[PDB]
Amino acid sequence: CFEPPPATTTQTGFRGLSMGEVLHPATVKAKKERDAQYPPALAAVKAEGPPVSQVYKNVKVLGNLTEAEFLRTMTAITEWVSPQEGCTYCHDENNLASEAKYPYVVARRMLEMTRAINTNWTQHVAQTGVTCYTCHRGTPLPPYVRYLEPTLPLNNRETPTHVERVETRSGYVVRLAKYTAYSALNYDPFTMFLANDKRQVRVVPQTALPLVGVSRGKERRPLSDAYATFALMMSISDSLGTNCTFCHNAQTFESWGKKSTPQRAIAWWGIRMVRDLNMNYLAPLNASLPASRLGRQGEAPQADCRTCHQGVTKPLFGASRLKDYPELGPIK
Amino acid sequence: ADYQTIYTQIQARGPHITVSGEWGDNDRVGKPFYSYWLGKIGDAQIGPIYLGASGIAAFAFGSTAILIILFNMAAEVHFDPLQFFRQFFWLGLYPPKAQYGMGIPPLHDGGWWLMAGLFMTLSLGSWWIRVYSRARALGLGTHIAWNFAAAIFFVLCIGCIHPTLVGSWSEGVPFGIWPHIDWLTAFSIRYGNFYYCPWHGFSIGFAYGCGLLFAAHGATILAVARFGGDREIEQITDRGTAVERAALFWRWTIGFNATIESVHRWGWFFSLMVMVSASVGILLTGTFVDNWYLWCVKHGAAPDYPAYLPATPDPASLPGAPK
Amino acid sequence: MYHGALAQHLDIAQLVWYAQWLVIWTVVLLYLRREDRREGYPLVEELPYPKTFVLPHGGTVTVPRRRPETRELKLAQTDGFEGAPLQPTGNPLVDAVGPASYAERAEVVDATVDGKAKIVPLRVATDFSIAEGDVDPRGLPVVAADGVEAGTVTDLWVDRSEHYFRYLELSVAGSARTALIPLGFCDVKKDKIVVTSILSEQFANVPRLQSRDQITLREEDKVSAYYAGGLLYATPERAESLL
Amino acid sequence: ALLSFERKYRVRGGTLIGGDLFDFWVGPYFVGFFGVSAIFFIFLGVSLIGYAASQGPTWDPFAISINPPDLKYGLGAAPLLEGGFWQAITVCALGAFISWMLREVEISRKLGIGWHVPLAFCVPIFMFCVLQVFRPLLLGSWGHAFPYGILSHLDWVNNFGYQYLNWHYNPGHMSSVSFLFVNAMALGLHGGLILSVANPGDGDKVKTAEHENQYFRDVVGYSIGALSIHRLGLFLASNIFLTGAFGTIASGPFWTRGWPEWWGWWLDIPFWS
Numbered sequence A: 001c002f003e004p005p006p007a008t009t010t011q012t013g014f015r016g017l018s019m020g021e022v023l024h025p026a027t028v029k030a031k032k033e034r035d036a037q038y039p040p041a042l043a044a045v046k047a048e049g050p051p052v053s054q055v056y057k058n059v060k061v062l063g064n065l066t067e068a069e070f071l072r073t074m075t076a077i078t079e080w081v082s083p084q085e086g087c088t089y090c091h092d093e094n095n096l097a098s099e100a101k102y103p104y105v106v107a108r109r110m111l112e113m114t115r116a117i118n119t120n121w122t123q124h125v126a127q128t129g130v131t132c133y134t135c136h137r138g139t140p141l142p143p144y145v146r147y148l149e150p151t152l153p154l155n156n157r158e159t160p161t162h163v164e165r166v167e168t169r170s171g172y173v174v175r176l177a178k179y180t181a182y183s184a185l186n187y188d189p190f191t192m193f194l195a196n197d198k199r200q201v202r203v204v205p206q207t208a209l210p211l212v213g214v215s216r217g218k219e220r221r222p223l224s225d226a227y228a229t230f231a232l233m234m235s236i237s238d239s240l241g242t243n244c245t246f247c248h249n250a251q252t253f254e255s256w257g258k259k260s261t262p263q264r265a266i267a268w269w270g271i272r273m274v275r276d277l278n279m280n281y282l283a284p285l286n287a288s289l290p291a292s293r294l295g296r297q298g299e300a301p302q303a304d305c306r307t308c309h310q311g312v313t314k315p316l317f318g319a320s321r322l323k324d325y326p327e328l329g330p331i332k
Numbered sequence B: 001a002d003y004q005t006i007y008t009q010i011q012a013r014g015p016h017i018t019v020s021g022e023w024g025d026n027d028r029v030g031k032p033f034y035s036y037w038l039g040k041i042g043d044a045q046i047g048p049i050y051l052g053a054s055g056i057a058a059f060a061f062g063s064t065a066i067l068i069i070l071f072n073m074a075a076e077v078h079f080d081p082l083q084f085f086r087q088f089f090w091l092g093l094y095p096p097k098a099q100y101g102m103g104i105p106p107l108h109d110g111g112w113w114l115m116a117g118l119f120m121t122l123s124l125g126s127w128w129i130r131v132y133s134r135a136r137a138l139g140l141g142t143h144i145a146w147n148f149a150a151a152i153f154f155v156l157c158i159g160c161i162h163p164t165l166v167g168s169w170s171e172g173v174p175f176g177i178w179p180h181i182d183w184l185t186a187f188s189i190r191y192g193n194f195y196y197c198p199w200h201g202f203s204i205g206f207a208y209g210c211g212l213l214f215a216a217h218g219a220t221i222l223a224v225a226r227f228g229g230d231r232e233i234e235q236i237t238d239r240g241t242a243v244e245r246a247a248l249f250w251r252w253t254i255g256f257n258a259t260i261e262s263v264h265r266w267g268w269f270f271s272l273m274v275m276v277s278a279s280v281g282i283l284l285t286g287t288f289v290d291n292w293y294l295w296c297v298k299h300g301a302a303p304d305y306p307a308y309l310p311a312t313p314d315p316a317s318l319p320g321a322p323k
Numbered sequence C: 001m002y003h004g005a006l007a008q009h010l011d012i013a014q015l016v017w018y019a020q021w022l023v024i025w026t027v028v029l030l031y032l033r034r035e036d037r038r039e040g041y042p043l044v045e046e047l048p049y050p051k052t053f054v055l056p057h058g059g060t061v062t063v064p065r066r067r068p069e070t071r072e073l074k075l076a077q078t079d080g081f082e083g084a085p086l087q088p089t090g091n092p093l094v095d096a097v098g099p100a101s102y103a104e105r106a107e108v109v110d111a112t113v114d115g116k117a118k119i120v121p122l123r124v125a126t127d128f129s130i131a132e133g134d135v136d137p138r139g140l141p142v143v144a145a146d147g148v149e150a151g152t153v154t155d156l157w158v159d160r161s162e163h164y165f166r167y168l169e170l171s172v173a174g175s176a177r178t179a180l181i182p183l184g185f186c187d188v189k190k191d192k193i194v195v196t197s198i199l200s201e202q203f204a205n206v207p208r209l210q211s212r213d214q215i216t217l218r219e220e221d222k223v224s225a226y227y228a229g230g231l232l233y234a235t236p237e238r239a240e241s242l243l
Numbered sequence D: 001a002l003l004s005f006e007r008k009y010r011v012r013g014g015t016l017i018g019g020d021l022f023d024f025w026v027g028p029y030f031v032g033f034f035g036v037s038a039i040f041f042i043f044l045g046v047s048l049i050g051y052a053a054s055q056g057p058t059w060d061p062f063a064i065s066i067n068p069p070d071l072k073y074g075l076g077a078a079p080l081l082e083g084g085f086w087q088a089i090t091v092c093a094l095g096a097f098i099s100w101m102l103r104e105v106e107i108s109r110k111l112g113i114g115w116h117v118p119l120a121f122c123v124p125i126f127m128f129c130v131l132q133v134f135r136p137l138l139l140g141s142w143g144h145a146f147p148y149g150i151l152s153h154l155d156w157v158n159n160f161g162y163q164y165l166n167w168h169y170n171p172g173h174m175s176s177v178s179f180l181f182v183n184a185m186a187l188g189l190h191g192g193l194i195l196s197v198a199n200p201g202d203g204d205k206v207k208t209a210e211h212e213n214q215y216f217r218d219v220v221g222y223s224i225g226a227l228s229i230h231r232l233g234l235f236l237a238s239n240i241f242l243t244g245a246f247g248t249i250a251s252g253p254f255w256t257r258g259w260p261e262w263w264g265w266w267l268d269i270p271f272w273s
């Protein structure tokens, strides 16, 4: 029923405002241990020699690497994504230039995606950055992905119960609930807010009085939007292992300046990054994946905050391999 | 210690009393029965109860609303009984999610909610008639009905009058345990933090005030139970030492005091004002204020605090920022 | 343009705020605080027009009561200071001062809705009984604060309107009389009724009823007040500081 | 200065300590040892609020705020301007409240009435201590306590709830609110019932104990009784905070997740999952 004390608490606002983190040490410990499994950087190799655009046949993204550097990247990718199957997860064992296995073409695109995150989305990932591991954690299917309807368990390495399965209609409300930190909010914030850029998260007026022409009848947004935004925030909070005060002074959720933390601005960039990943890199992979990887509407699995963060405010507690793998970005 | 203030040590039994009303004496139903254990802390007699057209109508209308709600809840779990029982609190009947304005929404998206609200409203109106008319039948003033009217009015404010004033049924309260709760936050969010609505604050001072007053008054009566202070009607018409001592307890404590009649007016007023204040807040919300925090800022009232972590500009305003 | 905006930097919610505070202070100060003054005024040592009640069984009363007769307080002042406490000049239980004080209620028997005597012993209320499970105190000894047996319970007095016992009546040992005691002063055990408010000797002077089988509102007050006085006066140490 | 019926009750006695020394009245107010101590602590507390407030940015009553220390001071002394005034005011506050309560005991004793009111008053004092003392001690810092400001304390309440994502799902809160609501309802029913009987209208007769019970038996099939409704009202009011306290103290020291998630004890039972 309960979590025994002591609680670890931080301060994220002016004294007397009850703003900050509230953490269970055993939980933090467990997540640190899981995340500590991040394989170390591979040893540095020879700088020096022909580029693989010359040496190999079908290199389209990493062509400027030396052979040693390139094969180092292939070793790293294998550890991070398909360590149990090895190189032949993506490659034809008798022809390494062949693109015949679907993971190969997906991986090329993921190389482009990863370089784009570390190059174009530094407003979010800073100099920490991401590798294949950040999401995949050693398996071809990342453990925390989203479809265009809620799915359970959140971690797809866990066996579902009958009621958790997406086909069992009686379990829908719980699938929704377990995506919004157990709330009864009747909204899927993934498809609403993170799959694409169609909706506005903000719902609160920035004036005291109602502006004429936007405040009556069909001029107005429905109150549902406010519930849906709350659902997104419950999800974001749970996805990062945190609460509203990490980012907001609840006095005024809609205000920036002294009323929001620096982390709130990083979160904002995070939403933008996720929409780009989903719209431009992940969703289009439905044409490359086997039917067995797709959801019930033919969608490829897509990313949310949890895909990388997995219950922690910085993914992997801020572990980085950025300087170890320059070929994953930032690209000059 | 006065053990009688804790429970009744020796309970009494006698023939059951019936006070005749101007009408409806023949519509009292039930054989009264006695609970010994209830009898320790209240009257042991349960029943009979009065039927009457308005109470019956209440039950017909209210049961209809409950059936609409429950059926929609059951559909939400695909009519699986185990999941219904498990998930009950999470289940709900929701106002329209799309903006149709004041258009009657589709049954799948708000229509059943509006229909349950219609039946609930009829049920509350019917019960109000019962509460009012029973007083009249028994030669009593209608003080309880008027207080009940303000509660009903508050429910109509959050149910249909605010929706009608801003012109959207999407703003109404859902039916359901957690879902009606989730609305509190949605609504507070939409209107810029209800802590900054002065009427929310008035309603809370009165609500807390009912706490204070019923603790203070209940305690006071128990404290003068040895003098029959619980017999408040004849203490009003013929002041006794019970209520002299009660008045003096408060006079000597806070410098002033009530009478045994007027303390009930204080309580009735405070109760009433919890609901009157709430209704006014709600009636101003969205109609004439869009963001209560910013309205307080406009009028110089809101507290401000130094930055702890660095002030953080809205990244949406940065040059080149995405939408 | 904004809904609710008025001339000046003025808006509708703003004007309703002032109105709401004005309504509250008007009700509190001009109504509620006036109703609060219908007893105890005018003060001794702003007022509403008198209120008249039509009584359930004929007649009227107008409050506050003005009694044609006025009681003598056996109290002396302890000092010249206006706020100094008073001190009993005799026996405060019999003289009924301090917490032994009673109100000058009507010398009328409180009535049921049908006009019968409301508070009556079970010997009169022959249709009433004690709930199964509870002690019948009749025939049990009453033991006073000093642990001395003061008398023996003879009857219970029931409120016929509320179905609730309000007094025990006991024969007073050695004094050829009976006395009532409110049940709030009684600790009802299986073998005895314990009364810590007064000592055994002090039962002799409990206020006496005019009639054996009925009790007036004033008598109820006199009876109840006597035991209450015991709490402060049963012994000399009861008026002094606890610590 | 005295009510018409007041003199006869103004006797010496009933003090817990002090004897005759403080056993007197100032106007209507009884003094007693705890009157003296109450005024002492009120004066000290209010003077500290004054000094602290003058050092701040505003004299606007809504905007003024005297805040506890940063978490990092723990349970130690904090400098006067950075949490120390708050610490001193809180000690004064508790002295005043406890003094108030004990003075009410002395008043009760003198009047020969029960001590039910001071006992009932122990409840809000207890809740104050939960908020400002017990919970902060369990978490290890006075900085978890609420600030003294008309509007600022609402900002604390607000952020505190949202630290647990949705405080409405807190079970001790659910109990607390339910009691708040049923208490307010019951006070209106009770006040209304008494007034309806004494004020039937027109020139109608005042009604009776029997009419009170008939009204509620008719409307809801049960009437609790004239004495019992007073016990019930005290019980309902008290339990706003007696049950609330559990939800307050749980939050942080015995639960670090959001409140809705706590309900997994029920939702996540394997046999219906």
Ligand code: BCB
Binding pocket: B200, B201, B202, B204, B205, B206, B208, B209, B212, D046, D049, D128, D131, D146, D150, D151, D153, D154, D157
């Ligand atoms: C965990 C939740 C809390 C909470 C949540 C809360 C909310 C959500 C709201 C309030 C509001 C209020 N609170 Mg607060 N509160 C208050 C006092 C107040 C008042 C400013 C106001 C109206 C209360 C009322 O009428 O109650 C019943 C008592 C009555 C009717 C008797 C009169 C009491 C009188 C108005 C108290 C005035 C105290 C002044 C601030 C002066 C302080 C002392 C000075 C003299 C040194 C005190 C004195 C305390 C203490 C001592 O602990 C306290 C604790 C809390 N409040 C907890 C931290 N309170 C309301 C408000 O309008 O805030 C601006 C409001 O909306």
Ligand code: BCB
Binding pocket: B061, B062, B063, B065, B066, B069, B119, B120, B123, B124, B151, B152, B154, B155, B158, B183, B184, B185, B187, B188, B193, B194, B195, B197, B199, B200, B203, B204, B207, B274, B277, B278, B279, B280, B281, B282, D157, D181
């Ligand atoms: C994050 C969200 C918040 C929020 C959102 C909120 C909203 C949206 C509204 C309030 C309102 C109110 N809030 Mg508030 N709030 C309150 C206290 C209160 C209440 C005093 C007040 C009136 C509501 C009421 O009495 O309903 C209880 C009484 C009711 C519901 C009346 C029911 C009567 C009816 C006749 C009964 C019918 C029963 C039938 C049997 C039903 C049959 C059904 C069948 C037929 C289907 C406190 C003490 C706090 C603290 C300590 O933090 C707080 C914080 C918050 N509130 C947060 C800021 N609050 C109301 C208000 O004042 O607005 C201005 C309001 O509308």
Ligand code: BCB
Binding pocket: B184, D097, D124, D125, D127, D128, D131, D157, D158, D159, D160, D161, D162, D166, D167, D168, D170, D172, D173, D176, D177, D180, D240, D241, D243, D244, D245, D246, D247, D248
């Ligand atoms: C977004 C945040 C939320 C929130 C956060 C919240 C928190 C953090 C806590 C509560 C708590 C509580 N909330 Mg709650 N809340 C409540 C209701 C309540 C109260 C029943 C309860 C107890 C308040 C308390 O501790 O007073 C305390 C009052 C005190 C201590 C008064 C002390 C008085 C003192 C002894 C005497 C003072 C004397 C003056 C100084 C004298 C002045 C001199 C003059 C008068 C002469 C309602 C009805 C709602 C609605 C309608 O939504 C709501 C929404 C919310 N609450 C939001 C979801 N709420 C508390 C609780 O029990 O939670 C389980 C609590 O800790």
Ligand SMILES: C/C=C1/c2cc3[nH]c4c(c3C)C(=O)[C@H](C(=O)OC)c4c3nc(cc4[nH]c(cc(n2)[C@@H]1C)c(C(C)=O)c4C)[C@@H](C)[C@@H]3CCC(=O)OC/C=C(\C)CCC[C@H](C)CCC[C@H](C)CCCC(C)C
Binding pocket: B208, B209, B211, B212, B215, B216, B219, B253, B254, D038, D041, D042, D043, D044, D045, D046, D089, D092, D093, D096, D097, D100, D104, D117, D118, D120, D121, D123, D124, D147, D148, D149, D150, D151, D153, D237, D238, D239, D240, D241
């Ligand atoms: C569940 C039980 C309920 C309950 C019960 C009862 N309630 C009682 C009794 C009972 C039985 C009485 O016997 C007693 C009394 O006499 O009644 C007339 C009393 C009283 N309830 C008061 C306020 C009250 N009740 C609240 C809540 C409940 N009550 C709950 C609901 C709340 C809320 C909800 O906020 C408030 C504000 C005072 C009016 C009065 C104490 C005066 C005092 O103690 O004088 C002595 C102290 C002073 C006169 C001032 C002290 C100033 C200090 C030093 C400096 C200020 C510090 C402060 C911390 C700053 C905070 C400011 C900030 C929040 C803005």
Ligand SMILES: CC(C)=CCC/C(C)=C/CC/C(C)=C/CC/C(C)=C/CC/C(C)=C/CC/C(C)=C/CC/C(C)=C/CC1=C(C)C(=O)c2ccccc2C1=O
Binding pocket: B212, B213, B216, B217, B218, B220, B221, B243, B246, B247, B248, B250, B251, B253, B254, B255, B256, B257, B258, B259, B260, B263, B266, D026, D029, D030, D031, D034, D035, D036, D038, D039, D042
């Ligand atoms: C002058 C000086 C310094 C003197 C020194 C001595 C000394 C200690 C003085 C104290 C000075 C101080 C601190 C005064 C402040 C007093 C305070 C705390 C005042 C607060 C008043 C408030 C806000 C009360 C809230 C509750 C409220 C709305 C009460 C109004 C209704 C009343 C009066 C209820 C009391 C009351 C109740 C509850 C009954 O049940 C009852 C039953 C039968 C008859 C009478 C009564 C009765 O009067």
Ligand code: HEC
Binding pocket: A055, A056, A057, A058, A059, A060, A061, A062, A063, A071, A074, A075, A077, A078, A081, A082, A086, A087, A088, A089, A090, A091, A096, A097, A103, A104, A105, A107, A108, A109, A111
């Ligand atoms: C999928 C996740 C892969 C795994 C596992 C391994 N490799 Fe790979 N390989 C992959 C891609 C997307 C590409 C093209 C990269 C680009 O920039 O376009 C490659 C390419 C190679 C080559 C070049 C072959 C050629 O075109 O001539 C070689 C020699 C190669 N990879 C080797 C290799 C080894 C040794 C691996 C296991 C340790 C391995 N790859 C794993 C995708 C993936």
Ligand code: HEC
Binding pocket: A077, A081, A103, A104, A106, A107, A110, A111, A114, A130, A131, A132, A133, A134, A135, A136, A140, A141, A142, A145, A277, A282, A289, A293, A300, A301, A302, A303, A307, A308
């Ligand atoms: C999180 C944002 C990711 C990062 C960083 C990388 N990948 Fe990824 N991958 C991600 C998703 C949401 C999916 C779709 C789910 C799926 O398993 O199909 C994928 C998929 C792949 C695959 C195909 C796996 C399969 O279906 O069998 C491969 C081979 C793959 N990803 C490779 C890969 C590489 C090499 C990465 C680093 C350069 C990398 N991914 C990063 C999410 C994310």
Ligand code: HEC
Binding pocket: A200, A201, A202, A203, A204, A205, A229, A230, A233, A234, A236, A237, A240, A242, A243, A244, A245, A246, A247, A248, A253, A254, A255, A263, A264, A265, A267, A268, A269, A271, B189, D162, D165, D166
């Ligand atoms: C940081 C990681 C956050 C946490 C934790 C929470 N929220 Fe948030 N919020 C965040 C951002 C980046 C934004 C803006 C998004 C955008 O695209 O503009 C928001 C927005 C809100 C809003 C709407 C504000 C408005 O201007 O209308 C609300 C009402 C809100 N957030 C509430 C909220 C709650 C209740 C949270 C905890 C449960 C919470 N947020 C967490 C960033 C972050």
Ligand code: HEC
Binding pocket: A117, A124, A125, A126, A128, A129, A130, A134, A236, A240, A263, A264, A266, A267, A268, A270, A271, A274, A303, A304, A305, A306, A307, A308, A309, A313, A314, A315, A318
């Ligand atoms: C992987 C591709 C990510 C996804 C998907 C999301 N985030 Fe992220 N985030 C990521 C990295 C590599 C970092 C580290 C940056 C650093 O400063 O060390 C972060 C950081 C954040 C933070 C800042 C935490 C802090 O500064 O203490 C926040 C608040 C954050 N991320 C929020 C967030 C949200 C709301 C997301 C979904 C919309 C999200 N992130 C996705 C990598 C990834």
Ligand SMILES: CC(C)=CCC/C(C)=C/C=C\C(C)=C\C=C\C(C)=C\C=C/C=C(C)/C=C/C=C(\C)CC/C=C(\C)CCCC(C)C
Binding pocket: B066, B069, B070, B104, B114, B116, B117, B118, B120, B121, B155, B156, B158, B159, B160, B172, B173, B174, B175, B176, B177, B180
């Ligand atoms: C076991 C006992 C006997 C009964 C069971 C009760 C039960 C299980 C009920 C159903 C499940 C539950 C518990 C539901 C709870 C729902 C709750 C708490 C809901 C709360 C609030 C809902 C509110 C305030 C809704 C208000 C709605 C309105 C006022 C609507 C008004 C509509 C109109 C006036 C219609 C006018 C418009 C016209 C065009 C038709």
Ligand SMILES: CCCCCCCC/C=C/CCCCCCCCOC(=O)[C@H](O)CO
Binding pocket: B001, B002, B005, B006, D114, D115, D116, D119, D120, D123, D231, D234, D235, D238, D239
């Ligand atoms: C406030 C609790 C909330 C629940 C209450 C509801 C039930 C009512 C119970 C009241 C018990 C307290 C009364 C004690 C006797 C009073 C004289 C006091 O004198 C005494 O003899 C003692 O030593 C002091 O208490």
Ligand SMILES: [Fe+2]
Binding pocket: B217, B221, B232, B264, D190, D194, D230
């Ligand atoms: Fe009463």
